[PDB]
Amino acid sequence: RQNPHDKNQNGQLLKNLQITYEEIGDIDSLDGVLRTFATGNLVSKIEELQYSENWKLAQDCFNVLGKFSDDPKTTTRMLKSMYDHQLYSQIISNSSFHSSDGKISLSPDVKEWYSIGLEAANLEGNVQTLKNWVEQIESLRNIDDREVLLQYNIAKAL
Amino acid sequence: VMAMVGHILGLGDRHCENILLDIQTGKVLHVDLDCLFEKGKRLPVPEIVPFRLTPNLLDALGIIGTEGTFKKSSEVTLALMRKNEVALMNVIETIMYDRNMDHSIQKALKVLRNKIRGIDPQDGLVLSVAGQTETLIQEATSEDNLSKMYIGWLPFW
Amino acid sequence: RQNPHDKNQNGQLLKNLQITYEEIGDIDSLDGVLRTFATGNLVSKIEELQYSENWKLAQDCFNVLGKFSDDPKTTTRMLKSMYDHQLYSQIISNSSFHSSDGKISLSPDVKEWYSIGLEAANLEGNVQTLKNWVEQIESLRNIDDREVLLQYNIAKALIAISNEDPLRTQKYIHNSFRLIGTNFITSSKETTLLKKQNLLMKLHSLYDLSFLSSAKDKFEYKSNTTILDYRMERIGADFVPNHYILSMRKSFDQLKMNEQADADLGKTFFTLAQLARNNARLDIASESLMHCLERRLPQAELEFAEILWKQGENDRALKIVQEIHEKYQENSSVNARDRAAVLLKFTEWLDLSNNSASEQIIKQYQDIFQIDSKWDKPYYSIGLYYSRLLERKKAEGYITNGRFEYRAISYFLLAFEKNTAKVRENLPKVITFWLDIAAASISEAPRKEMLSKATEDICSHVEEALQHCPTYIWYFVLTQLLSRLLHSHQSSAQIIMHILLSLAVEYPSHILWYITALVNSNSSKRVLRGKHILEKYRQHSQNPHDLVSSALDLTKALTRVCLQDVKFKFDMNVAPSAMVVPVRKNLDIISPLEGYQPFRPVVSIIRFGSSYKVFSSLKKPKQLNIIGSDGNIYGIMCKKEDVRQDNQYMQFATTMDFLLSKDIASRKRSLGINIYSVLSLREDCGILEMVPNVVTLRSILSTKYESLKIKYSLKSLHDRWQHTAVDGKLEFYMEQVDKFPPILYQWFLENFPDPINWFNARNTYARSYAVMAMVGHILGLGDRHCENILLDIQTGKVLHVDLDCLFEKGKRLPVPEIVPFRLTPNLLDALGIIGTEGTFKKSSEVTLALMRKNEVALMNVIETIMYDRNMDHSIQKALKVLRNKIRGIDPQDGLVLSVAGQTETLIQEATSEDNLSKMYIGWLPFW
Ligand SMILES: Nc1ncnc2c1ncn2[C@@H]1O[C@H](COP(=O)(O)OP(=O)(O)NP(=O)(O)O)[C@@H](O)[C@H]1O
Ligand SMILES: [Mg+2]
Numbered sequence A: 001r002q003n004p005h006d007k008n009q010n011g012q013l014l015k016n017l018q019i020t021y022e023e024i025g026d027i028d029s030l031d032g033v034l035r036t037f038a039t040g041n042l043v044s045k046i047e048e049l050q051y052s053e054n055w056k057l058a059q060d061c062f063n064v065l066g067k068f069s070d071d072p073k074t075t076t077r078m079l080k081s082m083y084d085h086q087l088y089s090q091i092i093s094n095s096s097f098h099s100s101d102g103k104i105s106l107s108p109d110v111k112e113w114y115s116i117g118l119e120a121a122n123l124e125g126n127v128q129t130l131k132n133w134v135e136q137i138e139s140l141r142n143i144d145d146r147e148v149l150l151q152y153n154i155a156k157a158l
Numbered sequence B: 001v002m003a004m005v006g007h008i009l010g011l012g013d014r015h016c017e018n019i020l021l022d023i024q025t026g027k028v029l030h031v032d033l034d035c036l037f038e039k040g041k042r043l044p045v046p047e048i049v050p051f052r053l054t055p056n057l058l059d060a061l062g063i064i065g066t067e068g069t070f071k072k073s074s075e076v077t078l079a080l081m082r083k084n085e086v087a088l089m090n091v092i093e094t095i096m097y098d099r100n101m102d103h104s105i106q107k108a109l110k111v112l113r114n115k116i117r118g119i120d121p122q123d124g125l126v127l128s129v130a131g132q133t134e135t136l137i138q139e140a141t142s143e144d145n146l147s148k149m150y151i152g153w154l155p156f157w
Numbered sequence C: 001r002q003n004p005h006d007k008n009q010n011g012q013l014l015k016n017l018q019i020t021y022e023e024i025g026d027i028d029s030l031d032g033v034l035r036t037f038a039t040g041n042l043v044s045k046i047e048e049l050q051y052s053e054n055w056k057l058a059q060d061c062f063n064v065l066g067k068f069s070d071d072p073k074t075t076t077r078m079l080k081s082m083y084d085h086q087l088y089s090q091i092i093s094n095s096s097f098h099s100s101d102g103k104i105s106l107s108p109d110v111k112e113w114y115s116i117g118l119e120a121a122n123l124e125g126n127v128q129t130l131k132n133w134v135e136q137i138e139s140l141r142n143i144d145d146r147e148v149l150l151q152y153n154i155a156k157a158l159i160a161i162s163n164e165d166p167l168r169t170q171k172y173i174h175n176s177f178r179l180i181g182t183n184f185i186t187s188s189k190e191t192t193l194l195k196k197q198n199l200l201m202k203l204h205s206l207y208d209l210s211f212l213s214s215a216k217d218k219f220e221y222k223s224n225t226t227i228l229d230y231r232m233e234r235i236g237a238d239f240v241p242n243h244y245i246l247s248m249r250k251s252f253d254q255l256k257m258n259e260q261a262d263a264d265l266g267k268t269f270f271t272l273a274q275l276a277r278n279n280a281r282l283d284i285a286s287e288s289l290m291h292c293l294e295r296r297l298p299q300a301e302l303e304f305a306e307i308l309w310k311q312g313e314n315d316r317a318l319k320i321v322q323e324i325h326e327k328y329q330e331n332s333s334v335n336a337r338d339r340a341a342v343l344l345k346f347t348e349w350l351d352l353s354n355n356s357a358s359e360q361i362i363k364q365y366q367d368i369f370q371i372d373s374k375w376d377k378p379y380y381s382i383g384l385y386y387s388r389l390l391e392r393k394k395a396e397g398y399i400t401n402g403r404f405e406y407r408a409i410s411y412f413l414l415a416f417e418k419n420t421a422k423v424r425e426n427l428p429k430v431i432t433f434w435l436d437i438a439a440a441s442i443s444e445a446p447r448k449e450m451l452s453k454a455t456e457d458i459c460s461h462v463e464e465a466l467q468h469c470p471t472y473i474w475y476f477v478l479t480q481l482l483s484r485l486l487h488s489h490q491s492s493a494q495i496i497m498h499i500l501l502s503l504a505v506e507y508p509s510h511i512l513w514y515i516t517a518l519v520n521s522n523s524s525k526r527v528l529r530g531k532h533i534l535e536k537y538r539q540h541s542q543n544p545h546d547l548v549s550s551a552l553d554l555t556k557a558l559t560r561v562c563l564q565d566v567k568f569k570f571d572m573n574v575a576p577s578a579m580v581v582p583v584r585k586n587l588d589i590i591s592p593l594e595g596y597q598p599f600r601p602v603v604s605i606i607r608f609g610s611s612y613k614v615f616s617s618l619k620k621p622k623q624l625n626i627i628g629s630d631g632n633i634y635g636i637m638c639k640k641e642d643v644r645q646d647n648q649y650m651q652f653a654t655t656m657d658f659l660l661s662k663d664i665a666s667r668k669r670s671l672g673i674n675i676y677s678v679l680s681l682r683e684d685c686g687i688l689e690m691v692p693n694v695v696t697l698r699s700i701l702s703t704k705y706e707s708l709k710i711k712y713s714l715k716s717l718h719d720r721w722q723h724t725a726v727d728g729k730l731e732f733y734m735e736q737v738d739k740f741p742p743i744l745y746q747w748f749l750e751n752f753p754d755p756i757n758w759f760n761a762r763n764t765y766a767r768s769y770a771v772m773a774m775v776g777h778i779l780g781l782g783d784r785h786c787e788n789i790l791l792d793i794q795t796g797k798v799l800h801v802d803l804d805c806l807f808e809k810g811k812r813l814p815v816p817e818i819v820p821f822r823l824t825p826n827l828l829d830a831l832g833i834i835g836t837e838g839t840f841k842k843s844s845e846v847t848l849a850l851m852r853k854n855e856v857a858l859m860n861v862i863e864t865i866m867y868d869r870n871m872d873h874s875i876q877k878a879l880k881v882l883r884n885k886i887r888g889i890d891p892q893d894g895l896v897l898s899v900a901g902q903t904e905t906l907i908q909e910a911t912s913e914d915n916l917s918k919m920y921i922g923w924l925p926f927w
């Protein structure tokens, strides 16, 4: 309000404003801000579908946006959108982890991927896809991530 | 919710001494309501708003204003009133037996039934919930409508 | 049948019987056999879902049935069900192949898996998942499988084509042609084209790889892509070959990393997207259109709107299409059609979304008219808008005004001058709007003077259209113009005579039959208008013959050959004439596509037939012959009965079959109804056409009962029925059906001994009988004795010929007809094994659904009955019962039943033996 919102500061204002609604619990202002004064890119119109009963129409759009291998964050958008819609078996079968069988080294943003991977591997009970995931976790050196180690410990409990 | 429960019941008389807000949680109640069944249109300098949507209220709704939780819960309320037409009309059938008159009270129930089913009040045929919502919002916040009404219902607030 | 099927041999009989339907092409008996006497296991009920629009509900059930690792064949069931539903990326990502990275050794049944794996790896173009699959194929020793090696050779063609190696990929495509031409290919003139088509799509995809590899630079590559787009026009419109060929051009254009190949690739993905959303398969239209967003085409913002529309969300599609419409307030972005069609789409499904008032939609309809006015698709849309809003107001308590019919006629008549391709289903709406308010301005005109001014200037609209629209488009409402002549308006009577003047000057030869049957009646008012309509015709300059007088010489002769009841060889040299034969292969209009001529080449009358025929039906009815311009016999039936009933039944049929030939639920199953041109001559007489090659099923059943020496009578058959009480009817029926075994299934064995022609003929029989089975009941057909159920020897269609009585008239007479339609135990096992629970029931429901979706058009066509006969309450009640049957109301305890409920009601009361005992032995039911 105090910023003159007639001017074009609403690009850097909104890339975190929608984050402040998508884990506050409220959707009906998130869906209201994503369709008001933020309608440049079509991908933003695709991200309205993942909260409005046609979420699987947005999932398979993200599955091929997320198979462009150009951004690290358009992959974790797909992974968080799978996790929010309970597609655990589809997370553990993703090619973002299985290059051939194993995964890449120490984690800049892959810790956000490995958290979702361990958690989905826990929620589908299969000792083989859970027992070789911890073969890959335990090959690391110094795991700093607060979020990975919980689902790791649940994994080794299982 | 009451923004069109009142309009479907034809609430009117919605001056700002009758829109009560509680300090505890922020609910909205509507207290006067003597007049009902579109009676606010019957008197001179007539009430031609559907409900008091009025520029203090809109930025209080949020940044996006009326295009947000207001519109969504509006459509959900209208969809619930369309799905339960027979029950709501059955509840409100007792008006014509509390007052036992004709054609000042039958027409009110017919306009009530047409608003519940979702008929636009001119060129009568059924409009959608997202159409009835858009109609009532863009004629409640329409500045050409808001100029016309009496200063007892002071609109510029 | 010969096996006692009461016993339990139907377990080993059916595990291959359903295989004999699931690649024969037919689903509606496969779905009928999977739900009849095969309902033990629940997995069989799951396998019904994979053919009935909820196939993905069966896919993810198979994905976890197929991840039990206990059977080798429940995996290949999942793989074939993925392949049949084009889930190629989901095949190549399956864990049935990727144990960790590679696959198992030499193949007992894994060859059936490796075929699907190679084929899906070809159809998704990725050099890495295709290049290490052939690392696993080539580790084998002795590949025997005929099917693996084709897709292998296509795979190594693609791998060489990614290595920029033209002669090597030509070598492997020639290997593919060798393998197809020696092994895969089979004999023509025995199989269908429906089973060759799975091989023709692989050949059509082998040609375009050679044709896209044979290029050195982009100058001929663009020409090759335009030739392939030409090859995508002979392809048809079915989804499977289109998706296969576009998937192979896709797989070419992303293994050859030219930038022109990438610009081709975006075009391929956009055509895949808009292919798949027009074929109710937007599951892959979305994940193909997202490939058009890395390229960022300027057109995917519009395509995602239709994918949102077909998915089911209206408001987000409206939001994005107006988001690109106010983006079209900027510069050039071609003004002609790329702006008017986007706004027209915004209006056309702001209408369907029901999110706006009428004036908001009209206020931008006129903006479409401003931005481009040389294009009648907006005029089509606004005419359909007013001629829909009229019903959506008249559904409430709305009465007759003029403006919403004024503007409907005003915009249809300006649509009709430009592209004229939707005249059939819109001009009867026009002229019933033209003559509803015209009679309303005569009924109680003194405000409702508004409709008098409304008719006062849509008469001017009709005259302006007639002076600058084509001539032939009035023929579609010709009989509806032949009625309503006695209209009592006198400003539309002149127009309804000028509308016949104009249609007589150009193209006389067809309509001169109707214009000479006009000047003949018993009520002496049609004859006055007939002389008045021939006066100015013979006053016109081109008078190519005296053929009006010879036309009356045909007319009065052909109406004199129905009075001479004998219980003669008159004039002969009237033929030949420039008058043309009344057969329906003279009198149709070829369906107007966008310099065409409205008719076939003229087959005129040459030699009037001398050998007449007359037979022992009810009164004494008779049949002539005509020899035409090709020297063929055209058969003529001359009835002494009011064939206005027949002509309007046939116009219901010829507005019904054109809806059947456009619905994708009925074009998939090739529904149609038979047809014959029938003309009036005078009240209680008429002429009608003879379909060739047909035979009654009385004539079938007589010569199939005499071939087994079953002794029976015809007059001793029903005196006993007269002697039966109200109790003896049921036992009499159940004994007379034990006398005669049902035998019509093997009459099909004795016309089509080629079993492929037999199977197609029995499907054609069941489907064509199923459509008229309730078109007749909805029209209240009756009188359906086996001398009027005609079957043709050529293909097996069903036609219904008598039909004098209509509009449930069979119930009005004693020993009444209380069947909906003749469904009768010779017919049911002729329908198949499952009988009525099969293609009959499915095409029944499809026909009823099409009649419910088109209630206003069908009722508008049949509105002319009350104006051919101008009575009350013997004909209004008939139309009301007709409307209630069209909407789907059960005839007792009136409230709307579903299509699968109305179908079940009519079938289980047609085959109900308590009903079948009651009816008269003329309609002999036990046959
Ligand atoms: N278009 C046609 N194609 C072939 N046969 C036809 C056609 N029209 C009539 N027929 C024949 O006409 C015969 C009976 O004529 P129909 O129109 O039923 O007059 P009808 O005297 O009323 N006969 P009916 O009422 O059954 O006693 C049928 O058995 C058919 O073989
Ligand atoms: Mg008050």
Ligand SMILES: [Mg+2]
Residues within 6 Å of the ligand: B032, B033, B034
């Ligand atoms: Mg008060």
Ligand SMILES: [Mg+2]
Residues within 6 Å of the ligand: C787, C788, C801, C802, C803
């Ligand atoms: Mg007959």
Ligand SMILES: [Mg+2]
Residues within 6 Å of the ligand: C618, C802, C803, C804
């Ligand atoms: Mg008859």
